[PDB]
């Protein structure tokens, strides 16, 4: 009860260091193959005076290839849908909070996103546009207080060859009650967001992502643990 | 120039919430298979009034199966060796600092470890000794300041079914000069430390680990990145 191919519509509203903007996205994904493409236009407040990379991971967790029979908390949540709240702390003091709602309308995923960022250094790589996109990352996921939690570390490539790192904490909340859901055991999700193309003078980004839900298979347990 | 079969000698000393302890370990590893085993004896401050799990990840990064031809910063550093410094911040306020010196004598690796932990909640899982070992984890590794940096998030299982999480930051420092080293690109390492057995009335822990160095292979790049 999510189709194997869907449309995506997203609407973002936010502020980074008090610079307000809006975006709208139109795209498509394959929820069970874990692949998706979004064409994201900054409709208000652009071209942005800061790196678009900081917005990228706020623009799709129902689209994930879940391996090893791990229960899919997101796909299970339809038709009701879900939401999430995230906090991102950058190692240089940048601090980004976000809230998102996800619903499904026929074959269209609809996302509403609020992002507020503060305390980004004025002369850091984000405010100066010196960043070159994200490394892939792995997010840990586990159940806490009856909902799903995630955390990950991410690394942003910089022009000079450094990485700028951050820590993400997400609470995912199904709009179904807990007793209607099969909850997963502790596991991981890998993510790989990439900007494929920038046009309209920085106002139109084509962004691809793939994500995979799995246990750790590289290192087997001697105790039969996942 | 590190043998396929090595002995491990490790010596750890420190205090957690002002509870002094000391440990000696004897063990063995296969540096290219990424597998190892330490038999860890608590020789002072036993029986530990806190969970031994918080010590576990401080007891071996020369032992890693490196895939995809990634340059091995640690195996390259012999015969000179290397050291590391780490900080671990637990989500409940617990805070642990550590430093370590690693040398190779014949086929014997020798570790000297200093570990200091403070601000651990008195009624938290660690000090109540109510943890059940670590989930496997994924560390990101990248170059900074001419040395190697690592970061990870780890998750401790608790008796009540919850997880207590923490963030690690590690600076790894070769004793070879940089111009003698082939530096790796951004990559990951998976680690899985497990307690296989406990004996001598709780003063002897047998601890197994496997580590794998790698890129993210589950989510292919569309831009030809690793």
Closest CA to A126 of A147, A148, A157, A80: A157
Chain B contact for A214, CB < 8 A? yes
Q: Could you report how far apart the first and last alpha carbons of chain B are, in Å?
A: 28
**If you search the block for the tokens 């194997």, which residue do you land on?**
A4
Give CA–CA dist A24/B103, Å, rounded. 56
Question: What number of residues does chain B have?
Answer: 226
Instruction: Report the distance separating Cα B178 and Cα A210, nearest Å.
Output: 36
Of A135, A142, A221, Cβ closest to residue B192: A221
Q: Is residue A108 packed enough to be buried (19+ CB in 10 Å), middle (13-18) or exposed (0-12)?
A: middle
The residues near B221 (Cβ < 8 Å, ≥ 6 apart) are A136, A192, A194
**Main-chain phi, psi angles of B57, to 5 degrees:** -75, 0
Burial class, B96, CB count within 10 angstroms (exposed 0-12 / middle 13-18 / buried 19+):
buried
Nearest Cβ partner for A218 among B208, B212, B219? B212
In 10 A of CB B174, how many CB atoms?
21
| Residues B209, B133: Cα–Cα separation, whole Å | 12
Interface contact A210, partner B, CB < 8 A: yes
A194 touches chain B (CB under 8 A): yes
Give contacts of B197 with chain A, Cβ < 8 Å: none
Spatial distance between the Cα atoms of B26 and B131, rounded to a whole number of angstroms:
24
Backbone angles phi, psi at B201, to 5 degrees: 50, 45
Q: A54, A165, A176, A109: which is closest to B140 by C-alpha? A: A165
Domains of chain A: 1-226 (2.40.155.10)
- Report resolution (Å) to 1 decimal: 2.2
**How distant is the alpha carbon of residue B70 from its chain centre?**
20
**Per this entry, what is the length of chain A?**
226
Angstrom distance (rounded) from CA B212 to CA B216: 12
CB pairs under 8 A between A and B: 91
The token pair at A208 is: 């691809």
- B142:A163 CB<8 A: yes
Task: State the DSSP code for A178.
Answer: G
Q: Is A47 helix (H, G, I), strand (E, B) or coil?
A: coil
Quickly list DSSP for chain B. ---SSEEEEEEEEEEETTEEEEEEEEEEEETTTTEEEEEEEEEESPSPSS-GGGTGGG--TT--EE-TT---TTGGGTTT-EEEEEEEEETTS-EEEEEEEEEEETTEEEEEEEEEEE---TTSTTTTT-EEEEPPEEEEEEEETTEEEEEEEEEEEETTS-EEEEEEEEEEEESS-GGG--PPPSEEEEEEEEEEEEETTTTEEEEEEEEEEE---SS--SSS--
The single-letter DSSP state of residue A49 is S
Between chains, do A210 and B220 touch, taking CB under 8 Å as contact? yes
Query: In angstroms, rounded to a whole number, what is the distance separating the alpha carbons of residues A67 and B161?
Result: 23
Structure method: X-ray
CB contact under 8 A, A194 and B153: no
| Closest residue, chain B, to A210 (C-alpha) | B219
Q: Which of B166, B161, B130, B164 is nearest to B49 (CA)?
A: B130
Residue A203 DSSP SS3: coil
The answer to whether residue A33 neighbours chain B at the CB level (below 8 Å) is no
* Interchain CB contact of A135 with B (< 8 Å): yes
Residues 6+ apart with CB under 8 A from B183: B71, B73, B143, B148
Q: Is B163 on the interface with A (CB under 8 A)?
A: yes
Candidates A135, A147, A187, A198: best to mutate against B (most CBs of B within 10 A) is: A135
How many CB atoms neighbour CB A66 within 10 A? Answer: 21
Judged by CB atoms closer than 8 Å, whether chains meet at B153 and A152 is answered as yes
Q: What does DSSP assign to residue A179?
A: G
Instruction: State both tokens at A106.
Output: 């026929």
Q: How far apart are the first and last CA of chain A?
A: 28
**CB of A218 within 8 Å of any CB in chain B?**
yes
Q: Do A151 and B165 touch (CB under 8 A)?
A: yes
Nearest CA distance, A211 vs chain B (angstrom) = 7
Count of alpha carbons within 13 angstroms of residue B69, beta-carbon side:
1
A201, two tokens: 């003078």
For residue A35, give how far its alpha carbon lies from the nearest alpha carbon of chain B (Å). 9
For B225, how many CA atoms within 13 A lie in the half-sphere containing its CB? 19
d(CA A104, CA A111): 9
Q: Is the peptide bond before B36 cis (omega within 30 degrees of 0)?
A: no
Q: CA A190 to CA A84: how far, in whole Å? A: 18
A162 in B contact zone (CB under 8 Å): yes
- Chain B partners of A167 at a C-beta cutoff of 8 Å? 153, 167
A53 neighbors A47 (Cβ within 8 angstroms): no
Q: Which residue of B has its CA nearest to A215?
A: B136
How far is it, in rounded angstroms, from Cα B217 to Cα B226? 8
Residue B71 CA to residue A130 CA, distance in Å, equals: 27
DSSP state of A88: E
Closest CA to A54 of A213, A199, A195, A173: A195
d(CA A183, CA B117): 34
Kindly state whether A153 is in contact with chain B, defined as any CB-CB distance less than 8 angstroms.
yes
CB-based contact (8 Å) between B68 and chain A? Answer: no
Residue A14 DSSP symbol = E
Smallest CA–CA distance, residue B136 to chain A, in Å, is 7
- Give the C-alpha separation, B217 to B151, whole Å: 19
Q: Work out the angle at residue B169's Cα, subtended by the Cα atoms of residues B188 and B124, and round it to the nearest 5 degrees.
A: 115
Q: Which residue has the tokens 């029979």?
A: A69
B87 forms beta bridges with B97, B169
DSSP 8-class letter at A78: T
């Amino acid at each position: 009860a999510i189709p194997e191919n869907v449309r995506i519509k997203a609407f973002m509203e936010g502020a980074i260091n008090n610079h307000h903007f809006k975006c709208e996205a139109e795209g498509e994904g394959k929820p069970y193959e874990g692949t998706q493409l979004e064409r994201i236009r900054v409709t208000e407040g652009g071209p942005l005076p800061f790196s678009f990379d900081i917005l990228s991971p706020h623009f799709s967790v129902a689209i994930t290839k879940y391996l090893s029979g791990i229960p899919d908390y997101f796909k299970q949540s339809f038709p009701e849908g879900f939401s999430w709240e995230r906090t991102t702390m950058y190692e240089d003091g940048g601090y980004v909070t976000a809230h998102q709602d996800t619903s499904l309308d026929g074959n269209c995923l609809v996302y509403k996103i609020k992002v507020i960022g503060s305390n980004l250094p004025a002369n850091g790589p984000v405010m100066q546009n010196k960043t070159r996109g994200w490394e892939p990352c792995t997010e840990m996921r586990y159940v806490r207080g009856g909902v799903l939690c995630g955390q990950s570390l991410m690394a942003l490539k910089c022009a000079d060859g450094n990485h700028l790192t951050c820590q993400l904490r997400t609470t995912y909340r199904s709009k179904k009650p807990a007793k209607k859901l099969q909850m997963p055991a502790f596991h991981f999700s890998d993510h790989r967001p990439e900007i494929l193309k920038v046009s309209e003078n920085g106002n139109l980004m084509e962004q691809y992502e793939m994500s995979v839900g799995r246990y750790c298979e590289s290192v087997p347990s001697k105790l039969g643990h996942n």
